[PDB]
mmCIF file of C-alpha atoms and ligand atoms in Angstrom:
data_model
loop_
_atom_site.group_PDB
_atom_site.id
_atom_site.type_symbol
_atom_site.label_atom_id
_atom_site.label_comp_id
_atom_site.label_asym_id
_atom_site.label_seq_id
_atom_site.Cartn_x
_atom_site.Cartn_y
_atom_site.Cartn_z
ATOM 1 C CA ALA A 24 -65.059 68.763 -117.484
ATOM 2 C CA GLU A 25 -64.845 71.248 -115.291
ATOM 3 C CA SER A 26 -61.032 72.561 -115.800
ATOM 4 C CA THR A 27 -61.202 75.428 -118.456
ATOM 5 C CA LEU A 28 -63.880 78.097 -118.878
ATOM 6 C CA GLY A 29 -65.554 76.569 -122.045
ATOM 7 C CA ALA A 30 -66.186 73.284 -121.023
ATOM 8 C CA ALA A 31 -67.564 74.305 -117.484
ATOM 9 C CA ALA A 32 -69.973 76.787 -119.306
ATOM 10 C CA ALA A 33 -70.564 73.866 -121.592
ATOM 11 C CA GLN A 34 -71.799 71.636 -118.662
ATOM 12 C CA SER A 35 -75.188 74.332 -118.431
ATOM 13 C CA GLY A 36 -75.429 74.620 -121.963
ATOM 14 C CA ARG A 37 -73.502 78.009 -122.668
ATOM 15 C CA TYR A 38 -70.215 79.180 -124.032
ATOM 16 C CA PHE A 39 -67.623 80.857 -123.016
ATOM 17 C CA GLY A 40 -66.095 82.941 -125.664
ATOM 18 C CA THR A 41 -63.068 85.094 -126.724
ATOM 19 C CA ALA A 42 -62.172 88.181 -129.161
ATOM 20 C CA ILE A 43 -59.102 87.183 -131.366
ATOM 21 C CA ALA A 44 -56.966 89.178 -133.410
ATOM 22 C CA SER A 45 -55.347 87.676 -136.638
ATOM 23 C CA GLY A 46 -52.129 89.888 -135.775
ATOM 24 C CA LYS A 47 -51.700 87.479 -132.907
ATOM 25 C CA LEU A 48 -52.129 83.859 -133.890
ATOM 26 C CA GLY A 49 -48.353 83.957 -134.664
ATOM 27 C CA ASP A 50 -47.604 83.925 -130.868
ATOM 28 C CA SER A 51 -47.849 80.509 -129.471
ATOM 29 C CA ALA A 52 -48.295 81.584 -125.592
ATOM 30 C CA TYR A 53 -51.639 83.804 -127.117
ATOM 31 C CA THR A 54 -52.993 80.497 -128.888
ATOM 32 C CA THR A 55 -52.098 78.066 -126.348
ATOM 33 C CA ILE A 56 -54.153 79.542 -123.838
ATOM 34 C CA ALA A 57 -57.247 81.172 -126.463
ATOM 35 C CA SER A 58 -57.111 77.255 -127.952
ATOM 36 C CA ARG A 59 -57.421 75.617 -124.711
ATOM 37 C CA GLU A 60 -59.957 77.749 -122.482
ATOM 38 C CA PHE A 61 -62.670 78.883 -125.273
ATOM 39 C CA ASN A 62 -64.989 77.274 -127.216
ATOM 40 C CA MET A 63 -66.293 80.409 -129.109
ATOM 41 C CA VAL A 64 -64.403 82.818 -131.284
ATOM 42 C CA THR A 65 -65.150 86.597 -132.089
ATOM 43 C CA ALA A 66 -63.038 88.426 -134.902
ATOM 44 C CA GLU A 67 -62.108 91.759 -132.919
ATOM 45 C CA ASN A 68 -61.503 93.725 -136.206
ATOM 46 C CA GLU A 69 -61.759 91.089 -139.662
ATOM 47 C CA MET A 70 -65.350 91.141 -140.305
ATOM 48 C CA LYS A 71 -65.674 94.905 -139.503
ATOM 49 C CA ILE A 72 -67.336 96.894 -142.774
ATOM 50 C CA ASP A 73 -63.821 98.096 -143.851
ATOM 51 C CA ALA A 74 -62.275 94.908 -143.757
ATOM 52 C CA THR A 75 -64.782 93.136 -145.496
ATOM 53 C CA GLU A 76 -65.737 95.645 -148.236
ATOM 54 C CA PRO A 77 -63.189 98.067 -148.594
ATOM 55 C CA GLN A 78 -63.673 98.881 -152.001
ATOM 56 C CA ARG A 79 -67.358 99.322 -153.532
ATOM 57 C CA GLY A 80 -68.702 95.994 -154.658
ATOM 58 C CA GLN A 81 -65.396 93.930 -154.103
ATOM 59 C CA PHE A 82 -64.963 91.662 -150.907
ATOM 60 C CA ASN A 83 -61.972 90.788 -149.338
ATOM 61 C CA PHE A 84 -62.390 87.916 -146.737
ATOM 62 C CA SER A 85 -58.894 86.998 -146.236
ATOM 63 C CA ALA A 86 -58.263 88.100 -142.484
ATOM 64 C CA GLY A 87 -61.778 87.282 -141.721
ATOM 65 C CA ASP A 88 -61.378 83.553 -143.480
ATOM 66 C CA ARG A 89 -58.012 83.309 -141.195
ATOM 67 C CA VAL A 90 -59.690 83.687 -138.096
ATOM 68 C CA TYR A 91 -62.944 81.488 -139.078
ATOM 69 C CA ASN A 92 -60.553 78.997 -139.941
ATOM 70 C CA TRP A 93 -58.204 79.085 -136.454
ATOM 71 C CA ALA A 94 -61.917 78.841 -134.782
ATOM 72 C CA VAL A 95 -63.089 75.841 -136.658
ATOM 73 C CA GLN A 96 -59.766 73.755 -136.645
ATOM 74 C CA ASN A 97 -59.536 74.371 -132.670
ATOM 75 C CA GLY A 98 -63.070 73.349 -132.045
ATOM 76 C CA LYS A 99 -65.090 76.394 -131.425
ATOM 77 C CA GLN A 100 -68.219 78.151 -133.062
ATOM 78 C CA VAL A 101 -68.039 81.931 -134.245
ATOM 79 C CA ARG A 102 -69.865 84.982 -133.573
ATOM 80 C CA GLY A 103 -70.093 87.581 -136.819
ATOM 81 C CA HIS A 104 -69.131 90.872 -135.963
ATOM 82 C CA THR A 105 -70.692 93.209 -137.293
ATOM 83 C CA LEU A 106 -72.678 93.938 -140.429
ATOM 84 C CA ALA A 107 -74.217 97.566 -140.208
ATOM 85 C CA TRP A 108 -72.450 99.902 -138.392
ATOM 86 C CA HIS A 109 -72.271 104.033 -138.171
ATOM 87 C CA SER A 110 -68.199 103.392 -137.656
ATOM 88 C CA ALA A 111 -65.493 101.438 -139.481
ATOM 89 C CA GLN A 112 -66.967 102.369 -142.905
ATOM 90 C CA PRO A 113 -64.942 102.884 -145.931
ATOM 91 C CA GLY A 114 -64.913 106.255 -147.554
ATOM 92 C CA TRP A 115 -67.130 105.290 -150.323
ATOM 93 C CA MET A 116 -69.494 104.167 -148.115
ATOM 94 C CA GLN A 117 -69.071 107.311 -146.080
ATOM 95 C CA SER A 118 -69.617 109.199 -148.988
ATOM 96 C CA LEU A 119 -73.530 107.732 -149.835
ATOM 97 C CA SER A 120 -76.528 109.023 -148.411
ATOM 98 C CA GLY A 121 -80.428 108.154 -148.817
ATOM 99 C CA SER A 122 -81.534 104.967 -150.814
ATOM 100 C CA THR A 123 -77.812 104.483 -152.640
ATOM 101 C CA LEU A 124 -76.556 104.251 -149.038
ATOM 102 C CA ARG A 125 -79.484 101.936 -147.862
ATOM 103 C CA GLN A 126 -78.951 99.725 -150.993
ATOM 104 C CA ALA A 127 -75.110 99.359 -150.007
ATOM 105 C CA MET A 128 -76.519 98.484 -146.621
ATOM 106 C CA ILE A 129 -78.204 95.570 -148.219
ATOM 107 C CA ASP A 130 -75.453 94.421 -150.352
ATOM 108 C CA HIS A 131 -72.977 94.487 -147.861
ATOM 109 C CA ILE A 132 -75.068 92.029 -145.474
ATOM 110 C CA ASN A 133 -76.047 89.557 -148.533
ATOM 111 C CA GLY A 134 -72.334 89.536 -149.539
ATOM 112 C CA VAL A 135 -70.472 88.932 -145.891
ATOM 113 C CA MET A 136 -73.541 86.412 -144.416
ATOM 114 C CA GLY A 137 -73.405 84.616 -147.691
ATOM 115 C CA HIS A 138 -69.527 83.995 -147.963
ATOM 116 C CA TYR A 139 -70.066 82.374 -144.104
ATOM 117 C CA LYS A 140 -73.762 80.823 -145.104
ATOM 118 C CA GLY A 141 -74.602 78.414 -142.499
ATOM 119 C CA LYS A 142 -71.056 78.900 -140.426
ATOM 120 C CA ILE A 143 -71.677 81.414 -138.305
ATOM 121 C CA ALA A 144 -73.716 80.970 -134.695
ATOM 122 C CA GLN A 145 -74.637 84.371 -134.158
ATOM 123 C CA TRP A 146 -74.338 87.835 -136.322
ATOM 124 C CA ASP A 147 -73.961 91.246 -134.731
ATOM 125 C CA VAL A 148 -76.241 92.741 -137.664
ATOM 126 C CA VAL A 149 -76.495 96.211 -136.253
ATOM 127 C CA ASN A 150 -74.058 97.448 -133.725
ATOM 128 C CA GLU A 151 -74.187 100.525 -131.798
ATOM 129 C CA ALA A 152 -77.099 102.613 -133.090
ATOM 130 C CA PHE A 153 -78.176 104.492 -130.138
ATOM 131 C CA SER A 154 -76.846 107.980 -128.631
ATOM 132 C CA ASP A 155 -74.716 108.438 -125.684
ATOM 133 C CA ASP A 156 -76.650 111.515 -124.987
ATOM 134 C CA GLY A 157 -79.016 110.382 -122.383
ATOM 135 C CA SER A 158 -82.197 110.708 -124.340
ATOM 136 C CA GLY A 159 -82.721 107.282 -125.303
ATOM 137 C CA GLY A 160 -83.195 107.775 -128.948
ATOM 138 C CA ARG A 161 -81.360 106.916 -131.926
ATOM 139 C CA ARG A 162 -77.843 108.112 -132.879
ATOM 140 C CA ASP A 163 -77.662 110.653 -135.844
ATOM 141 C CA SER A 164 -75.855 108.823 -138.468
ATOM 142 C CA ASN A 165 -75.633 108.555 -142.253
ATOM 143 C CA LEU A 166 -77.916 105.258 -141.894
ATOM 144 C CA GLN A 167 -80.569 106.669 -139.440
ATOM 145 C CA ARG A 168 -80.762 109.554 -142.238
ATOM 146 C CA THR A 169 -81.897 106.760 -144.709
ATOM 147 C CA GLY A 170 -85.027 106.367 -142.502
ATOM 148 C CA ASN A 171 -85.563 104.946 -138.905
ATOM 149 C CA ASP A 172 -86.620 101.444 -140.580
ATOM 150 C CA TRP A 173 -82.847 100.661 -141.373
ATOM 151 C CA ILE A 174 -82.478 98.362 -138.331
ATOM 152 C CA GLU A 175 -85.878 96.435 -139.265
ATOM 153 C CA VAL A 176 -84.654 96.005 -142.903
ATOM 154 C CA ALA A 177 -80.863 95.219 -141.862
ATOM 155 C CA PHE A 178 -82.631 92.177 -139.929
ATOM 156 C CA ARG A 179 -85.172 90.819 -142.620
ATOM 157 C CA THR A 180 -82.408 91.171 -145.020
ATOM 158 C CA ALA A 181 -79.947 89.153 -142.791
ATOM 159 C CA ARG A 182 -82.583 86.528 -142.222
ATOM 160 C CA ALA A 183 -82.974 86.092 -145.474
ATOM 161 C CA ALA A 184 -79.283 85.874 -146.427
ATOM 162 C CA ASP A 185 -78.232 83.354 -144.137
ATOM 163 C CA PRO A 186 -81.432 81.467 -142.171
ATOM 164 C CA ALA A 187 -79.366 79.346 -139.993
ATOM 165 C CA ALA A 188 -77.829 82.284 -137.861
ATOM 166 C CA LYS A 189 -79.336 83.970 -134.679
ATOM 167 C CA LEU A 190 -79.328 87.687 -135.111
ATOM 168 C CA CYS A 191 -78.338 89.971 -132.629
ATOM 169 C CA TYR A 192 -78.817 93.872 -132.063
ATOM 170 C CA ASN A 193 -75.192 94.662 -129.953
ATOM 171 C CA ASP A 194 -74.080 97.609 -127.940
ATOM 172 C CA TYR A 195 -72.607 99.170 -124.791
ATOM 173 C CA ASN A 196 -73.814 101.166 -121.794
ATOM 174 C CA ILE A 197 -77.286 99.078 -121.869
ATOM 175 C CA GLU A 198 -76.439 96.918 -119.277
ATOM 176 C CA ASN A 199 -77.873 99.205 -116.446
ATOM 177 C CA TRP A 200 -81.646 98.863 -115.893
ATOM 178 C CA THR A 201 -82.400 102.541 -115.082
ATOM 179 C CA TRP A 202 -80.275 104.363 -117.763
ATOM 180 C CA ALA A 203 -82.474 106.028 -120.900
ATOM 181 C CA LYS A 204 -80.116 104.291 -123.473
ATOM 182 C CA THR A 205 -80.878 100.654 -121.976
ATOM 183 C CA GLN A 206 -84.548 101.767 -121.677
ATOM 184 C CA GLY A 207 -84.475 103.057 -125.823
ATOM 185 C CA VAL A 208 -82.998 99.781 -126.755
ATOM 186 C CA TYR A 209 -85.739 97.624 -124.804
ATOM 187 C CA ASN A 210 -88.287 99.798 -125.993
ATOM 188 C CA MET A 211 -87.245 99.285 -129.462
ATOM 189 C CA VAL A 212 -86.929 95.359 -129.554
ATOM 190 C CA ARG A 213 -90.170 95.187 -127.513
ATOM 191 C CA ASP A 214 -91.822 97.049 -130.689
ATOM 192 C CA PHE A 215 -90.151 94.893 -133.132
ATOM 193 C CA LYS A 216 -91.421 91.682 -131.181
ATOM 194 C CA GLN A 217 -94.600 92.854 -131.510
ATOM 195 C CA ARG A 218 -94.463 93.087 -135.105
ATOM 196 C CA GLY A 219 -92.210 90.331 -136.161
ATOM 197 C CA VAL A 220 -89.282 91.966 -136.791
ATOM 198 C CA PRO A 221 -86.610 88.997 -136.868
ATOM 199 C CA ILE A 222 -84.317 89.494 -133.826
ATOM 200 C CA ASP A 223 -83.233 86.363 -132.104
ATOM 201 C CA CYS A 224 -81.085 87.816 -129.405
ATOM 202 C CA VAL A 225 -79.299 91.263 -128.093
ATOM 203 C CA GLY A 226 -75.905 91.690 -126.910
ATOM 204 C CA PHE A 227 -74.730 93.302 -123.892
ATOM 205 C CA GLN A 228 -71.199 94.396 -124.894
ATOM 206 C CA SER A 229 -70.505 94.528 -121.028
ATOM 207 C CA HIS A 230 -67.462 97.081 -120.455
ATOM 208 C CA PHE A 231 -67.795 97.696 -116.878
ATOM 209 C CA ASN A 232 -65.580 100.636 -115.392
ATOM 210 C CA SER A 233 -65.396 103.873 -113.911
ATOM 211 C CA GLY A 234 -67.665 105.468 -116.414
ATOM 212 C CA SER A 235 -70.143 102.313 -116.463
ATOM 213 C CA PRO A 236 -69.914 100.557 -113.406
ATOM 214 C CA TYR A 237 -71.321 97.221 -112.696
ATOM 215 C CA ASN A 238 -74.584 97.205 -110.918
ATOM 216 C CA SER A 239 -76.528 94.227 -109.797
ATOM 217 C CA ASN A 240 -79.682 95.423 -111.655
ATOM 218 C CA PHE A 241 -77.842 93.972 -114.777
ATOM 219 C CA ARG A 242 -79.871 90.714 -113.800
ATOM 220 C CA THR A 243 -83.055 92.552 -114.084
ATOM 221 C CA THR A 244 -82.073 93.643 -117.343
ATOM 222 C CA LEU A 245 -81.000 90.025 -118.955
ATOM 223 C CA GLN A 246 -84.398 89.200 -117.274
ATOM 224 C CA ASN A 247 -86.375 91.349 -118.595
ATOM 225 C CA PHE A 248 -85.384 91.425 -122.494
ATOM 226 C CA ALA A 249 -85.767 87.726 -122.153
ATOM 227 C CA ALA A 250 -89.457 88.065 -121.463
ATOM 228 C CA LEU A 251 -89.678 89.870 -124.879
ATOM 229 C CA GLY A 252 -89.017 86.330 -126.509
ATOM 230 C CA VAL A 253 -85.160 87.108 -127.268
ATOM 231 C CA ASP A 254 -81.913 85.225 -126.117
ATOM 232 C CA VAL A 255 -79.323 87.536 -124.342
ATOM 233 C CA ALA A 256 -75.897 87.059 -124.920
ATOM 234 C CA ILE A 257 -72.386 88.824 -122.870
ATOM 235 C CA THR A 258 -70.372 89.859 -125.956
ATOM 236 C CA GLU A 259 -67.471 91.639 -125.055
ATOM 237 C CA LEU A 260 -67.013 91.595 -121.235
ATOM 238 C CA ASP A 261 -64.312 93.074 -119.280
ATOM 239 C CA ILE A 262 -63.780 94.750 -116.053
ATOM 240 C CA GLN A 263 -61.364 97.592 -114.864
ATOM 241 C CA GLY A 264 -59.136 96.136 -112.487
ATOM 242 C CA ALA A 265 -60.423 92.645 -112.746
ATOM 243 C CA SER A 266 -62.123 92.367 -109.248
ATOM 244 C CA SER A 267 -62.946 88.678 -108.635
ATOM 245 C CA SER A 268 -66.317 89.737 -107.170
ATOM 246 C CA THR A 269 -67.386 91.055 -110.007
ATOM 247 C CA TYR A 270 -66.287 88.731 -112.651
ATOM 248 C CA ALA A 271 -68.377 86.094 -110.461
ATOM 249 C CA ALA A 272 -71.118 88.421 -110.490
ATOM 250 C CA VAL A 273 -71.351 89.142 -113.844
ATOM 251 C CA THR A 274 -70.952 85.208 -114.398
ATOM 252 C CA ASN A 275 -74.126 84.228 -111.954
ATOM 253 C CA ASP A 276 -76.507 86.755 -113.873
ATOM 254 C CA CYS A 277 -75.927 84.714 -117.043
ATOM 255 C CA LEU A 278 -76.045 81.875 -115.040
ATOM 256 C CA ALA A 279 -79.455 82.789 -113.978
ATOM 257 C CA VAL A 280 -81.246 83.664 -116.988
ATOM 258 C CA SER A 281 -82.060 80.594 -119.176
ATOM 259 C CA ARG A 282 -82.023 82.376 -122.217
ATOM 260 C CA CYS A 283 -78.673 83.713 -121.561
ATOM 261 C CA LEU A 284 -76.749 81.714 -124.337
ATOM 262 C CA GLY A 285 -73.262 82.195 -122.989
ATOM 263 C CA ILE A 286 -70.213 84.883 -122.411
ATOM 264 C CA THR A 287 -67.300 86.365 -124.550
ATOM 265 C CA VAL A 288 -64.530 88.321 -122.842
ATOM 266 C CA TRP A 289 -63.042 91.016 -125.101
ATOM 267 C CA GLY A 290 -59.587 89.550 -125.269
ATOM 268 C CA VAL A 291 -57.201 86.704 -124.471
ATOM 269 C CA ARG A 292 -54.832 88.509 -121.895
ATOM 270 C CA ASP A 293 -54.417 92.070 -120.548
ATOM 271 C CA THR A 294 -51.863 92.710 -122.829
ATOM 272 C CA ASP A 295 -54.283 92.166 -125.846
ATOM 273 C CA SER A 296 -56.875 94.227 -124.613
ATOM 274 C CA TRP A 297 -58.297 97.876 -126.090
ATOM 275 C CA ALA A 298 -57.458 98.664 -122.562
ATOM 276 C CA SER A 299 -54.273 96.980 -121.390
ATOM 277 C CA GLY A 300 -53.657 99.874 -118.988
ATOM 278 C CA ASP A 301 -56.867 99.021 -117.282
ATOM 279 C CA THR A 302 -55.691 94.942 -117.093
ATOM 280 C CA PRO A 303 -59.343 94.096 -117.213
ATOM 281 C CA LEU A 304 -59.053 90.677 -118.777
ATOM 282 C CA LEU A 305 -58.190 86.991 -117.086
ATOM 283 C CA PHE A 306 -54.768 86.493 -117.740
ATOM 284 C CA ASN A 307 -51.923 88.176 -117.550
ATOM 285 C CA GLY A 308 -49.536 89.619 -120.221
ATOM 286 C CA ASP A 309 -47.129 86.426 -118.657
ATOM 287 C CA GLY A 310 -50.194 84.133 -119.646
ATOM 288 C CA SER A 311 -50.599 83.078 -115.867
ATOM 289 C CA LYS A 312 -54.306 83.243 -114.542
ATOM 290 C CA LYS A 313 -55.395 85.970 -112.382
ATOM 291 C CA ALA A 314 -57.539 85.572 -109.607
ATOM 292 C CA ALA A 315 -60.789 86.517 -111.388
ATOM 293 C CA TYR A 316 -60.190 83.207 -113.556
ATOM 294 C CA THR A 317 -60.792 81.016 -110.519
ATOM 295 C CA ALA A 318 -64.047 82.620 -109.721
ATOM 296 C CA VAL A 319 -65.492 82.641 -113.263
ATOM 297 C CA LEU A 320 -64.742 79.145 -113.031
ATOM 298 C CA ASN A 321 -65.981 78.245 -109.693
ATOM 299 C CA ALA A 322 -69.319 80.069 -110.614
ATOM 300 C CA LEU A 323 -69.506 78.240 -113.897
ATOM 301 C CA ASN A 324 -68.979 74.830 -111.931
HETATM 302 O O1 LIG B 403 -73.897 105.864 -119.096
HETATM 303 C C1 LIG B 403 -74.329 105.358 -118.032
HETATM 304 C C2 LIG B 403 -73.783 105.907 -116.834
HETATM 305 O O2 LIG B 403 -75.135 107.054 -116.860
HETATM 306 C C3 LIG B 403 -74.925 104.887 -115.654
HETATM 307 O O3 LIG B 403 -74.322 105.906 -114.507
HETATM 308 C C4 LIG B 403 -74.893 105.161 -113.237
HETATM 309 C C5 LIG B 403 -76.231 105.528 -113.392
HETATM 310 O O4 LIG B 403 -76.500 105.609 -111.575
HETATM 311 C C6 LIG B 403 -75.785 106.540 -110.946
HETATM 312 O O5 LIG B 403 -76.331 106.713 -109.802
HETATM 313 C C7 LIG B 403 -74.572 105.638 -110.728
HETATM 314 O O6 LIG B 403 -73.711 105.733 -109.866
HETATM 315 C C8 LIG B 403 -73.918 105.629 -112.362
HETATM 316 O O7 LIG B 403 -72.661 104.905 -112.214
HETATM 317 O O8 LIG B 403 -74.408 103.767 -115.738
HETATM 318 C C9 LIG B 403 -74.103 103.122 -116.643
HETATM 319 C C10 LIG B 403 -73.434 103.575 -118.169
HETATM 320 O O9 LIG B 403 -73.478 103.104 -119.254
HETATM 321 O O1 LIG B 404 -60.474 96.467 -132.170
HETATM 322 C C1 LIG B 404 -60.752 97.315 -130.912
HETATM 323 C C2 LIG B 404 -61.914 97.270 -130.347
HETATM 324 O O2 LIG B 404 -62.509 95.979 -130.158
HETATM 325 C C3 LIG B 404 -61.994 98.375 -129.356
HETATM 326 O O3 LIG B 404 -63.475 98.572 -129.097
HETATM 327 C C4 LIG B 404 -63.725 99.162 -127.637
HETATM 328 C C5 LIG B 404 -64.840 98.793 -127.361
HETATM 329 O O4 LIG B 404 -65.324 99.634 -126.090
HETATM 330 C C6 LIG B 404 -65.584 100.802 -126.300
HETATM 331 O O5 LIG B 404 -66.271 101.518 -125.392
HETATM 332 C C7 LIG B 404 -64.169 101.135 -127.051
HETATM 333 O O6 LIG B 404 -64.050 102.422 -126.803
HETATM 334 C C8 LIG B 404 -63.500 100.503 -128.107
HETATM 335 O O7 LIG B 404 -62.267 100.895 -128.353
HETATM 336 O O8 LIG B 404 -61.660 99.518 -129.476
HETATM 337 C C9 LIG B 404 -60.038 99.290 -130.082
HETATM 338 C C10 LIG B 404 -60.155 99.010 -131.389
HETATM 339 O O9 LIG B 404 -58.533 98.445 -131.920
#
């Protein structure tokens, strides 16, 4: 097996995943495809900071749990997304700084991971901490203003919180090997690995489009981060115009790297994409397969 994306990836030790939006689970066409094709689920919004801790010190896991439970009941594993981020913060957290803010970061990591303890295959512990200004440096958030070690502390906290889970750093525009952002992250992870900061994996969101095109040095990137001693994962894949060439290229990149755990596409049908107008996923609004679907399946087989 062979007939579906997740099974085919499973033949070679990997997964094929999707993002799930709880708001679409009452649509049987959505859940039929989702349930059938994928063996990994990420929650598109329901584990973001403002969804799990909207009030200081009180957690809310309902929408979270509805996605966690749907995935488990239909035989998939789960990726957690995401524990520490500059964006999607509640106002209470947005208002803090320095060590108060750092302490809220640690408490947030512990509350959320504690709730799903032992039930999450991978966690995006830190998401999108690097600038888009071409410098290669960190972003200038409230989190950075507590001190440069915030990322390190995030990972150490997360490790204590749930020893069972792989810990990922996750970002976008880090797929092109020659670009400054990529090299900034590569440099950071290498520093971490030299000093024993517990980072298990790196997540390449892999949003390909006109402002950040696919480039065949994606393979080089994956290989290079792998040699540092971490797993790599494609976490939010989508491709503007869904060319079959390019969907097969990305897939074979992952299949060439043995520390590449798997592929997640960011949505089930074109109509469920953050960029629906770009029709960048593997199923049409109909529910019918697109041409890229077959190319991904052949590469997997
Ligand atoms: O932000 C990043 C872009 O700056 C990067 O741009 C590519 C770099 O090399 C150029 O010769 C390519 O044409 C250009 O598209 O691509 C990735 C993106 O994340
Ligand atoms: O929940 C949705 C997010 O998953 C989505 O995230 C997108 C990821 O790529 C970024 O470059 C896009 O700008 C970003 O929007 O965004 C919409 C949100 O509802």
